Amino acid sequence: KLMASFDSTKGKKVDGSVNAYAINVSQKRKYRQYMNRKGGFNRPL
RNA sequence: AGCUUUGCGCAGUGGCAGUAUCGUAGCCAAUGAGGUUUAUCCGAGGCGCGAUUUGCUAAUUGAAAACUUCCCAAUAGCCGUGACGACUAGUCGGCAUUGGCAAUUUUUGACAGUCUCGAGACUGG
Secondary structure, three states, X not given: OOOOOOOXXXXXXXXXXXXXXXXXXXXXXXXXXXXXXXXXXXOOO
């Protein structure tokens, strides 16, 4: 009724917000080319 | 032979450099420039105009500051699962990837500070 048998969460996935990771990255700005391209007028992807 | 003087040239230490350093082709000047001192004396440039090479390096703006770039795709531990295989439903080896790996036996920290002569003691109020 306690809800027995002492537990040890090793390897087992834990319950909740324990798994919280957060990565702050910001990549370099990929701009497009306009002047002196040799390519056709609309942008490349 | 040594010392030494004067002028010039070279290099070096240092100092100075817009009341400084010069050019002058224009004029004047020791056949005298310029002189308030000392003038029956002194003695050198003066007035104007006109100037203030070269190499190296830094920094800034600028898209670009002058010596022959960006982007996409793919390659470069263990527990389960799927097959393949091997050995007797079970076990083992390698391969593969479609969940997980901070709660006492390990990989998410009983560590940190102190003191004494390789060895121990104290504290975490």
